[PDB]
C-alpha cells in the first residue's frame, strides 16, 4: 500500500472525515473501526460519541499533514465514501481511536483487512487498560 496526500475539509464524526483528495472533495469512512456516533435518530448521540468525534477532529485539524492510505480491495463503499486508513503527522487516526478505547475494531471484510491485527492488538490493550468504552 502507499500513503497519498490529502487536505482536510471538515471532520464530520468520529469515523467520517471530508477531505480534498486529488483535487476533489470526498467523504472518507475510516477503515476497520466503529466509533460511537453523534448522528443517528435511532439512538441520537451515543455514549463516547462526542468524545470520539472531538478526538478525530482535534487530531486532523492540528496536523501538519494528512495522508490517506487505501487498502487492497474496494476503495469506496455503497454510499460513495472512500474507504481508507487516515494518517495525521504519520500517526494512524484509526489506530489512535482504538488505542484510546474510543472505537472498536469493525467487522472485517477481506481483502480490506491489511492492518487488522495491529488494530486488534491496540484494542486488546485499551480493553486491558479499561479505557473509555471499556471502562
Topology:
Elements: E1 4-13, E2 16-21, E3 24-30, E4 33-34, H1 49-61, E5 66-70, E6 82-88, E7 91-92, H2 93-99, E8 104-105, H3 116-128
Parallel strand pairs: 3-6
Antiparallel strand pairs: 1-2, 1-5, 2-3, 4-8, 5-6, 6-7
Helix pairs in contact: 2-3
Subcellular location: Secreted
Region (Disordered): 115-135
Active site: 29, 37, 81
What does it look like?
This protein is α+β, with helices and mostly antiparallel strands and 135 residues long. The chain has a single domain, classed as OB fold (Dihydrolipoamide Acetyltransferase, E2P) (Beta Barrel). 24% of the residues lie in helices and 30% in strands. It contains 3 helices and 8 strands, in the order E-E-E-E-H-E-E-E-H-E-H. The chain has a 5-stranded mixed beta barrel. It has a two-stranded antiparallel sheet with strand order 4-8. Strand 6 and strand 7 form a beta hairpin. It is globular. The protein starts with a strand and ends in a 7-residue tail after the last helix. 35% of the residues are buried. This is Nuclease A. It is found in: Secreted. The PDB classes it as hydrolase.
Amino acid at each position: 500500500l502507499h500513503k497519498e496526500p490529502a487536505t482536510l475539509i471538515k471532520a464530520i464524526d468520529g469515523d467520517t472525515v471530508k477531505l480534498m483528495y486529488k483535487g476533489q472533495p470526498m467523504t472518507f469512512r475510516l477503515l476497520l473501526v466503529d466509533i460511537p456516533e453523534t448522528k443517528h435518530p435511532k439512538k441520537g448521540v451515543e455514549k463516547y460519541g462526542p468524545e470520539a468525534s472531538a478526538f478525530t477532529k482535534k487530531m486532523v485539524e492540528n496536523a501538519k499533514k494528512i495522508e490517506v492510505e487505501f487498502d487492497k480491495g474496494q476503495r469506496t463503499d455503497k454510499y460513495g465514501r472512500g474507504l481508507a486508513y487516515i494518517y495525521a503527522d504519520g500517526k494512524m487516526v484509526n489506530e489512535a481511536l482504538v488505542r484510546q478505547g474510543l472505537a472498536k475494531v469493525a467487522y472485517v471484510y477481506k481483502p480490506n483487512n491489511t492492518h487488522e491485527q495491529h488494530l486488534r492488538k491496540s484494542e486488546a490493550q485499551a480493553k486491558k487498560e479499561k479505557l473509555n468504552i471499556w471502562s
